[PDB]
Design a protein around this ligand. Structure first.
Ligand SMILES: CO[C@H]1/C=C/O[C@@]2(C)Oc3c(C)c(O)c4c(O)c(cc(O)c4c3[C@H]2O)NC(=O)/C(C)=C\C=C\[C@H](C)[C@H](O)[C@@H](C)[C@@H](O)[C@@H](C)[C@H](OC(C)=O)[C@@H]1C
Ligand SMILES: [Mg+2]
Ligand SMILES: [Zn+2]
Lengths: 221, 1112, 102, 158, 104, 7, 14
DNA sequence: GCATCCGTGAGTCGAG
DNA sequence: TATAATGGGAGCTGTCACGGATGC
């Protein structure tokens, strides 16, 4: 009990172990059933505890390493009368273990925390209430992206429709993806050198217009 | 200046050390200075004694323990965010019964936090105070049955979580029932289990009204103790097989087990005194010679039937009586958790004894310290009784340590709390303050220890009383419990005395709290002082007798909220308690012995004593308190100065020359002013900001971590993408802002760059990138910046780094940088001021000096209070304080007027007369007669019946000045205020509610994860909450579109809010809002509940609000 | 009135100088009350220099004299300096009207 | 399941409840596949029902399911909907809203009945989009973004 | 259309299976190393949706030009990641279980 | 702590 | 009521 | 018909 | 994979104010 699994869960996993024991048992050895059963029961329970109790699942060997690290650290703290540093644990774990390895192991062993954990005396505060959502774009960012699209359409209309469309196909404003010189050249019916040339002059005219009005400078962050 | 004291009351004994509750409790618990063999059985010693020995066969036994020395000093602990604590070592011996093998070893049990000198703790770097808890004392009580008037309920209560309550009741059917774990069963059965036979109960209980026949059952005595025991076990444990030894074990665990069921020593004594018996152990029964023996139940049943019969000398109990309510102090709570942890340790020890190598085992291999450590740590970090220290001023801490809470573990829950619990009991007298408590939900649940009150070893609050023998009042003092107080006749402290003899024929006294007028022959005891009736905060209110109890409460509470000012002064009218409060809070620095002062520095004071030794005292300077107020000490002495024992050396925070300074003494005029003081608002003079009255330093801490990521490391650097030299101006080489630079909102305190999340550039970004021909950098600017509304000067920077000596952080963290910013806050409109009498208000106007109402000699007033605040509130203390303050203004002297013994009217009038001489006679000598305006005002006052007609102008001006009123000229006009106005010095404090902290506004900002709604709080730059009631408001106004905006456009309608913002910045009206995201979340949650939520049209044909994204 | 203060080895107002009893907050508080008379009508600003050390009580007199500038209150206390206590100041006094906060 | 500022993960209790459910279920499927006795399958089924119960309404029947090393009940769907902190009362009939603020009140005597004193900074932040727009309407800024970046710092205010 | 009504009723197991974009066969949440959803787990992108807008799990199709296209290799549709708010999963019980609400 | 704001 | 007690009873049968 | 048991309610913003 | 080992622990206590369901 207390190792991260419910009493009944432990019981059921131990039952699975018992079943394994029954199917693998040989009475010819003149051993009582308890002796051979206990091994498989303990094995199944331990496997369950290792494969379950973590919200983010960790491989069983890794869990073994982590628990070994914990026993080591606890021994060291019992001998030293203080919490061991990373270096002391590293030295105590033998060769292959430096401070960085101990730290990375501990870090990788960090369990998640509940979003419903209260921050206060009353029922009012939840931890998750303080967590900003970074995913959905802010109204400001959205409006700035919109004004960007509009200003780019402003500067692309100052070109001829051909060069504007070549630039638009090359940077992928149309379908969202960038075509090569061969594809825009095959679509416009010219050579790749020619399509790259009109892309060059389009971009250059854009550079001139930008050096002139300076509308697109503020969007560069 | 001369401090003149009033009052005829002579205090026999001074106030006890105020923190003694905390310090003595904890000291008593630890016994760290007591050698192991000399330790009494108490506290952690008692915990060890309870837990050990452990059996099952191996045996692990306890010898002694020891507490070592702290690995780090207090200050260092505060800085490194550690816990101030001492190692706990325990000497144990493992013993094999058969083998006889004995192995002795000292095992390390982890750490126990140490209490600092001032009676606080340091937990994880933060100062925390453990608040003592009030509860129902263990024992035996008898209380009237609510249903059946003629009957009663007997209750047997042990210590909290020390085992179950037991209810003995006489049932309607006549049988006496016992309730345990919510199970009613006939008490007769248990009596048989104890070994009682019908004869014994017949002779013991026979004398009564034949209630005993209800205890008489033939089927019960027809079975021996074993059979009765198994019967009871079958009754209390359905489904559990009734094995003999299991039944004995369970019933023993419920009744006779000291390790499980424990009355307090208080419960022991109280049960003894109540039932008139003597207890051997602290349990209700025993297991002796294989059977069970009864200590308690029979005396209890006896007393019960004796109460039912009406037998004289038997009475019910008041559970609100302070003889029946006790206090669990720091030591008891900590010891309780220690005992729990130790129990867990024993469970683990046995579990480890069963398996494992049976030959080689040591106390080290058996014992795991983890449960004990986790227990103690749980107590200090997460317990509701472990509280973040109140550091606002020293009085805050001192009061915090003296707090008595009915809440917490085993304590009451509010919303469950009735009126009877919150009431002031008659026995509160001298013990718990009748005044100081909260106004809100916690009222009466949280209280304060009285000034002279003490807590005994049993945990009961005691108050001192002087012995009176034959009308002679001795100097012998006796501290009494409420139960002992009830036994005497106690005279009041203000009753007249000539020498040691009572000088009155009729003296006022108390009998069981009831007021009675008796003769001096009848007086057994007499009150030590009026001071003992109240708390420390309440005792700081002068002229308290003139204040209604409620406003007294308000002022009392409000003093705790006083902010330390750079110029802070002691009150002109004190209670005489102003010095002790500073001395006990350990704010001020004092002199240990007589001697000469060698050195005086701003950072230090070096002192040579008579011992010839040089003792150096360092000064705490501009440290940040828990509440952000600046706590700093300043030296009050000079080089070479001779100082006796106890002389002042350094002046603590909120302290002036050893006296408690919570604010300024300002010259106030009480008159309405142009509606600016309307409804408790206050008007102040700009001359207060000019001379820096009410100016306070505040320090705020900013913290940033650079860690290791799977996308690459974060780093503190001065190199920040897309930023100018203008923005990096105040940043040093490492990227940390320099000391002394002024920082404003938007500035960079600490530069930081984080590797960008994997980013697919949007086509517009790619095209723009091609246009300007600039590489998109791999890192982005995460730098810690000054929050909105914040800012000040940078007074400190702390940098910790992994790979640096003595430095190890939490896993994954490379480095931690802290920046301390101090700001000097003047007074400003919106700040809160208050006096000690419960008058509180916000400064609504700061007038230029020329607008301010002034005296004839050209002296303007600092503060204009509104008179309308006085009458409804009924606090007259401020008036008297003001009058005596005026006197003290012109005589250049302060006063001490103790509560209930103090300056009365006539003496104040004399002082005001002298003051008038100084204020006027000078003027006459200066060659200036009475002003025309003063004539007009004198005509007015003459009509008001204020002055006697016919007198000379000087005489009438003196008559007014004596009533505490003067002639006042309006600064805008020059014309006099038609009436005379009350003007005088008043002591006013600046409370910690400051507009600079509270003001916040937002257009758009962060949104929550699931709800997609604006975050709460100013710190999060979130929005205000528009709640059900605000919605009701808008509905009643019938503003539909406003409400719809609140519900949709302003919050949680994504497309709607984005569109709205874009529209507004474009200059377009806001679009029609759409479905709020939280309703979509509702729908999906309901689907997760296996309920189908369909939004239809009028055609009952489904409408899809998810726009197809949720449908295959 | 005095509009500015610089002390050597002092970064900000909140700091304490070794050998000096008064904290910088208090020193500036004392400097506020300094009365500086200008004899010249055309002189808009003056920087007073103070250099002091050793055991002594530094008063207003200790300011290095400037032409057409007179201190009207020479007895005004500034600091209390201990043995080895060293104070070096440059204060800026200006002509102005009314009350202008820092 | 979200990574907070410190690089640590924070998650909802519904994940633990769902995990309980899934684990007990799968174990039941394997116990059935292997033909375990009754008194085993029975126990498993019972625990499955109690798992589903804990998920939908927790602490409704019997003891509430708690996380390891805590006395705190886990938050189930029923808890998410109902209650003062519930979805309806907290997030539906009421909300935290934008373009809002708060501060201390002080009496203006001078105000006409229809007026209120509003602090400058408060108003600036409250009305901010409008201010950007009117800043682009005049020559104070070339465009919106410029105006916003201009208002961001306090020493850039004019 | 305009929404004039809101209906609530007991969902059939078939309807529940109709909502679901897949079954969660594993208790797993995310991987202890890659910090990405597991297969057939509570957070799996196969079922509930893509984490990045218009980008599949493996990263084979990164653009809006593919819309509704389910990657063959990673089995993840490319659409607006917002769908992760809208898409129900399901768990298929071995034994029927009584809805607590209707029982208690 | 509540009422009209003692604490 | 208590699932553990119930299972221990059922186990206590065989 | 009348005692008794089990579940569900018990103020608002603010900071935390 | 084999000495034999065969039924668990912690409860947790000063609210009413009840509503409708259930019980001699
Ligand atoms: C850890 O306890 C927390 C709640 C536990 O839950 C509860 C259920 O149990 C208690 C206990 C056992 C108490 O005695 C409380 C108490 O006396 C309060 C207010 C509470 O609500 C109390 C609470 C609970 O709400 N009134 C006061 O103290 C007043 C008369 C003076 C002091 C005021 C200052 C401002 C505080 O002292 C402050 C510096 C800080 O210490 C507390 C706010 C602390 O917050 C933290 C961070 O420590 C609270 C108490
Ligand atoms: Mg190594
Ligand atoms: Zn793919």
């Amino acid at each position: 009990t207390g190792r991260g699994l419910s009493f009944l869960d432990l019981i059921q996993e131990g039952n699975q172990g018992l079943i394994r024991a029954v199917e693998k048992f040989e009475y010819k050895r003149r051993f009582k059933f308890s002796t051979y059963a206990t091994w498989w029961i303990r094995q199944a329970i331990n496997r369950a505890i290792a494969d379950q109790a973590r919200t983010i699942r960790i491989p069983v060997h890794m869990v073994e390493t982590i628990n070994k690290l914990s026993r080591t650290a606890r021994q060291l703290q019992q001998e030293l009368g203080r919490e061991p540093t990373y270096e002391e644990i590293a030295e105590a774990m033998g060769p292959g273990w430096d401070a960085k390895r101990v730290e990375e192991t501990l870090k990788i062993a960090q369990e998640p925390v509940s979003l419903e954990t209260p921050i206060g005396d009353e029922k009012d505060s939840f931890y998750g209430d303080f967590i900003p959502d970074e995913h959905l774009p802010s109204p400001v960012d959205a409006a700035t992206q919109s004004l960007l699209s509009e200003e780019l359409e402003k500067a692309l209309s100052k070109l001829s429709e051909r060069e504007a469309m070549v630039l638009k196909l090359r940077k992928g404003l149309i379908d969202g993806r960038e075509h090569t010189l061969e594809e825009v050249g095959a679509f416009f019916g010219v050579t790749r050198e020619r399509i790259r040339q009109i892309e060059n002059k389009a971009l250059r005219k854009l550079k001139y217009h930008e050096s002139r009005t300076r509308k697109l400078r503020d969007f560069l962050d | 200046m001369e401090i003149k004291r009033f009052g005829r009351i002579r205090e026999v004994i001074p106030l006890p050390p105020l923190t003694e509750i905390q310090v003595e409790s904890y000291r008593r618990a630890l016994q760290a200075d007591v050698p192991p063999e000399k330790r009494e059985n108490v506290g952690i010693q008692a915990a060890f004694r309870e837990t050990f020995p452990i059996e099952e066969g191996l045996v692990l036994d306890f010898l002694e323990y020891r507490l070592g020395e702290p690995p780090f000093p207090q200050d260092e602990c505060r800085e490194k965010d550690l816990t101030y604590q001492a190692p706990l070592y325990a000497r144990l011996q493992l013993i094999h019964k058969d083998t006889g093998l004995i192995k002795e070893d000292e095992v390390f049990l982890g750490h126990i936090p140490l209490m600092t000198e001032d009676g606080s703790f340091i937990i994880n770097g933060a100062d925390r105070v453990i608040v003592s808890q009030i509860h129902r004392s263990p024992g035996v009580y008898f209380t009237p049955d609510p249903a059946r008037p003629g009957r009663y309920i007997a209750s047997i209560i042990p210590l909290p979580k020390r085992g179950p309550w037991i209810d003995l009741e006489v049932e309607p059917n006549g049988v006496v029932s016992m309730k345990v774990n919510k199970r009613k069963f006939p008490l007769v059965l248990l009596l048989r289990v104890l070994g009682y036979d019908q004869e014994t109960l017949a002779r013991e209980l026979g004398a009564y009204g034949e209630l005993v026949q209800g205890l008489m059952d033939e089927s019960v005595f027809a079975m021996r103790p074993e059979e009765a025991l198994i019967r009871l076990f079958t009754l209390l444990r359905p489904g559990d097989p009734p094995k003999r030894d299991k039944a004995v074990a369970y019933v023993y665990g419920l009744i006779a087990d000291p390790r499980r069921y424990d009355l307090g020593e208080a419960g022991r004594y109280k049960a003894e005194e109540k039932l008139g018996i003597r207890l051997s152990g602290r349990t209700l029964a025993r297991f002796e010679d294989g059977e069970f023996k009864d200590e308690v139940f029979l005396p209890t049943l006896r007393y019960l039937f004796a109460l039912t019969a009406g037998v004289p000398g038997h009475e019910v109990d008041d559970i609100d009586h302070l003889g029946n309510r006790r206090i669990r102090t720091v030591g008891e709570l900590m010891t309780d958790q220690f005992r729990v942890g130790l129990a867990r340790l024993a469970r683990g020890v046995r579990e480890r004894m069963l398996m494992g190598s049976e030959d080689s085992l040591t106390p080290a291999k058996l014992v795991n310290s983890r449960p004990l450590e986790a227990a103690i740590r749980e107590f200090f970090s997460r317990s509701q009784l472990s509280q973040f220290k109140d550091e606002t001023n020293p009085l805050s801490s001192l009061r915090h340590k003296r707090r008595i809470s009915a809440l917490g573990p085993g304590g009451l829950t509010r919303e469950r709390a009735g009126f009877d619990v919150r009431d002031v009991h008659r026995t509160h007298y001298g013990r718990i303050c009748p005044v100081e408590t909260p106004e809100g939900a916690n009222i009466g649940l949280i209280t304060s220890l009285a000034a002279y009150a003490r807590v005994d070893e049993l945990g009961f609050i005691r108050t001192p009383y002087r012995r009176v023998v034959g009308g002679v009042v001795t100097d012998e003092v006796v501290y009494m419990t409420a139960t002992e107080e009830d036994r005497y006749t106690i005279a009041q402290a203000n009753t007249p005395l000539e020498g040691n003899r009572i000088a009155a024929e009729r003296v006022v006294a108390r009998r069981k709290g009831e007021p009675v007028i008796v003769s001096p022959e009848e007086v057994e005891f007499m009150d030590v002082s009026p001071k003992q009736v109240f708390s420390v905060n309440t005792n700081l209110i002068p002229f308290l007798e003139h204040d209604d109890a409620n406003r007294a409460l308000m002022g009392s509470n409000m003093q705790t909220q006083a902010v330390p000012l750079i110029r802070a002064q002691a009150p002109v009218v004190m209670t005489g308690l102003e010095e002790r409060v500073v001395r006990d809070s350990l704010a001020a620095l004092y002199a240990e012995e007589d001697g000469e002062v060698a050195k005086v520095d701003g950072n230090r004071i070096v002192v040579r004593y008579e011992d010839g030794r040089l003792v150096e005292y360092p000064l705490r300077r501009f440290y940040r308190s828990n509440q952000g107020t600046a706590l700093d000490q300043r030296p009050r002495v000079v080089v070479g100065q001779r100082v006796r024992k106890g002389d002042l050396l350094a002046d603590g925070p909120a302290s002036e020359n050893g006296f408690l300074a919570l604010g300024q003494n300002v010259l106030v005029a009480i008159m309405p002013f142009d509606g600016y003081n309307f409804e408790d608002a206050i008007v102040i003079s700009e001359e207060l900001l000019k001379r820096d009255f009410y100016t306070s330093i505040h320090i705020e801490r900013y913290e940033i971590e650079a860690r290791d990521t799977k996308l690459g490391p974060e780093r503190i650097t001065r190199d920040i993408p897309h930023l100018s030299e203008a923005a990096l101006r105040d940043l040093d080489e490492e990227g940390v802002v320099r000391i002394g630079a002024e920082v404003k909102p938007g500035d960079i305190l600490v530069g930081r760059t984080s590797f960008k999340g994997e980013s697919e550039p949007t086509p517009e970004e790619r095209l723009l990138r091609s246009i300007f021909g600039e590489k998109a950098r791999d890192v982005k600017d995460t730098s810690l910046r000054v929050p909105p509304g914040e800012g000040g000067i940078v007074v400190r920077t702390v940098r910790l780094r992994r790979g640096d000596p003595g430095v190890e952080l939490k896993p994954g963290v490379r480095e931690v940088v802290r920046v301390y910013v101090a700001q000097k806050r003047k007074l400003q409109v919106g700040d809160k001021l208050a006096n000690r009498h419960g008058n509180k208000g916000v400064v609504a106007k700061i007038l230029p000096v020329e607008d301010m109402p002034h005296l004839p000699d050209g002296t303007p007033v600092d503060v204009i209070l509104n008179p309308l605040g006085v009458p409804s509130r009924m606090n007259l203390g401020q008036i008297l304080e003001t009058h005596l303050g005026l006197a003290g203004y012109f005589l250049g002297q302060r006063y001490i007027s103790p509560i209930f013994d103090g300056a009365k009217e006539p003496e104040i009038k004399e002082l005001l007369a002298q003051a008038f001489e100084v204020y006027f006679g000078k003027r006459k000598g200066e060659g200036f007669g009475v002003d025309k305006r003063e004539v007009e005002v004198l005509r007015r006052a003459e009509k008001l019946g204020l002055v006697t007609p016919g007198k000379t102008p000087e005489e009438q001006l003196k008559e007014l000045f004596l009533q505490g009123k003067v002639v006042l000229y309006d600064g805008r006009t020059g014309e006099p205020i038609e009436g005379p106005i009350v003007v005088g010095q008043m002591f006013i404090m600046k409370l910690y509610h400051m507009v600079e902290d509270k003001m916040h506004a937002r257009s758009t900002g962060p949104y929550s994860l699931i709800t997609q709604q604006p975050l709460g709080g100013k710190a999060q730059f979130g929005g205000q909450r528009f709640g059900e009631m605000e919605v009701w408001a808008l509905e009643a106004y019938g503003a539909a579109h406003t409400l719809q905006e609140m519900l949709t456009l302003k919050s949680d309608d994504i497309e709607g809010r984005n569109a709205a913002y874009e529209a507004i910045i474009k200059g377009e009206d806001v679009p029609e809002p759409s479905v709020p995201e939280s309703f979509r979340v509702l729908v999906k949650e309901l689907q997760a509940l296996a309920l189908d939520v369909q939004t239809l049209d009028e055609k009952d044909n489904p409408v899809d609000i998810f726009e197809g994204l949720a449908s295959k | 009135a005095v509009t500015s203060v610089y002390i050597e080895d002092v970064l900000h107002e909140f700091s304490t100088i070794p050998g000096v009893k008064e904290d910088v907050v208090e020193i500036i508080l004392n400097l506020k009350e300094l009365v500086v008379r200008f004899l010249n009508p055309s002189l808009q600003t003056v920087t007073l220099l103070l250099k002091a050390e050793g055991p002594k009580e530094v008063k207003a007199r200790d300011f290095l004299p400037v032409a057409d500038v007179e201190i009207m209150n020479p007895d005004l206390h500034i600091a209390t300096l201990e043995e080895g206590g060293r104070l070096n100041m440059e204060v800026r006094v200006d002509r102005g009207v009314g009350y202008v906060p820092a | 399941m979200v990574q907070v500022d410190g690089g640590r993960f924070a998650t909802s209790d519904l994940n633990d409840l769902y995990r309980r459910l899934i684990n007990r279920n799968n174990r039941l499927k394997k116990l059935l596949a292997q033909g375990a006795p009754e008194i085993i399958i029975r126990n498993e089924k019972r625990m499955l029902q109690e798992a589903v119960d804990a998920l939908l309404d927790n602490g409704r029947r019997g003891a509430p399911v708690t996380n390891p090393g805590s006395d705190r009940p886990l938050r189930s769907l029923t808890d998410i909907l109902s209650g003062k902190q519930g979805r309806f009362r907290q997030n539906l009939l009421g909300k935290r809203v934008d373009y809002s603020g708060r501060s201390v009140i002080v009496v203006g005597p001078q105000l006409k009945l229809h007026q209120c004193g509003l602090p400058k900074r408060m108003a600036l932040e409250l009305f901010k989009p409008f201010l950007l727009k009117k800043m682009e309407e005049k020559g104070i800024a070339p465009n919106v973004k410029a105006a916003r970046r201009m208002l961001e710092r306090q020493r850039d205010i004019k | 259309k305009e929404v004039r009504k809101v209906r609530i009723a007991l969902a059939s197991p078939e309807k529940i299976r109709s909502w679901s974009y897949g079954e969660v066969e594993k208790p797993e949440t995310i991987n202890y190393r890659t910090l990405k959803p597991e297969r057939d787990g509570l957070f799996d992108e196969r079922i509930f949706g893509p984490i990045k807008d218009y980008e599949c799990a493996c990263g084979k199709y990164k653009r809006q030009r593919f819309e509704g296209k389910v990657c063959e290799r990673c089995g993840v549709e490319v659409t607006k990641s917002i769908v992760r708010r809208y898409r129900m999963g399901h768990i298929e019980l071995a034994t029927p279980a009584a809805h607590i609400w209707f029982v208690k | 702590a509540x009422x009209x704001x003692x604490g | 009521s208590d699932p553990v007690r119930q299972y221990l009873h059922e186990i206590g049968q065989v």
